[PDB]
Design a protein around this ligand. Structure first.
Ligand SMILES: C=C(C)[C@H]1CN[C@H](C(=O)O)[C@H]1CC(=O)O
Length: 250
């Protein structure tokens, strides 16, 4: 009937419009994408914000999945449309459509990862949780192994809790802090006032954001084909361009 869509607030994917109710209270790349996939797929839907404000990780002790991944695994939501990175750990428990947006871990400064690793004057870190932190923690690649060893025991802490906190840390560190985040957010922030941040070097890895459904869900096939069609039509490119550049401030 009404498909339950779990999502999360993260600019410019989903934001509260700056007097409204329901789905109209929200706006953003993922809000427009949700309307497009629902249209193609022919379904009615309700956008809900994830209760714990998490993306999805499996607790080491309890072994239960939190965030949006959890809402799908434990049947509280039918689909998740947000900047949810496709990873092997999450793929084992849920289905992802073909990526609707490409990305890679990147470097944000006010060069290369290898350059950051073999240096010591510019501090650097990631979010305290997430796919980016996990990439470093589990990487067998020498350069990233070295970066992780440095980050995990750096005093004071090089980690931050939100994107906004990492961005702020960069801006106020006068060239002494590099923030490792997804290139998508790096590109977005570069077009935001005071226009004082920049992405340097190539990405450290390669993946995408995908629409997620419960393993074996009937909606899966349809949402994947819709993603392929929107991409082919150039719609996903126009949509990223709208929210990143058309709406840029620099
Ligand atoms: C914004 C947050 C916390 C998200 C967005 N995609 C990643 C994820 O799906 O884990 C996280 C960022 C990162 O890990 O650098």
């Amino acid at each position: 009937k009404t498909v339950v869509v779990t999502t999360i607030l993260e600019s410019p994917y989903v934001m509260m419009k700056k007097m409204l109710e329901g789905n109209e209270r929200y706006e953003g790349y993922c809000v427009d994408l949700a309307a497009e996939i629902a249209k193609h797929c022919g379904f009615k839907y309700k956008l809900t914000i994830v209760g714990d404000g998490k993306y999805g990780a499996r607790d080491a002790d309890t072994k239960i999945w939190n965030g949006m991944v959890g809402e799908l695994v434990y049947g509280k939501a039918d689909i998740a449309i947000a900047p949810l990175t496709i990873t092997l750990v999450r793929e084992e428990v849920i289905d992802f459509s073909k990526p609707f947006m490409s990305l890679g871990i990147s470097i944000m400064i006010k060069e290369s990862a290898e350059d950051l690793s073999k240096q010591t004057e510019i501090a650097y870190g990631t979010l305290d949780s997430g796919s980016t932190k996990e990439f470093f923690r589990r990487s067998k690649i020498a350069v990233f192994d070295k970066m992780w060893t440095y980050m995990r025991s750096a005093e004071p802490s090089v980690f931050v809790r939100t994107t906004a906190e990492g961005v702020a840390r960069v801006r106020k560190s006068k060239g002494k802090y590099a923030y490792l985040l997804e290139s998508t957010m790096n590109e977005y922030i570069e077009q935001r006032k005071p226009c004082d941040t920049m992405k340097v070097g190539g990405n450290l890895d390669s993946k995408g954001y995908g629409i997620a459904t419960p393993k074996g869900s009937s909606l899966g096939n349809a949402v994947n084909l819709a993603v392929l069609k929107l991409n082919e039509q150039g719609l996903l490119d126009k949509l990223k361009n709208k929210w990143w550049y058309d709406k840029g401030e620099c």
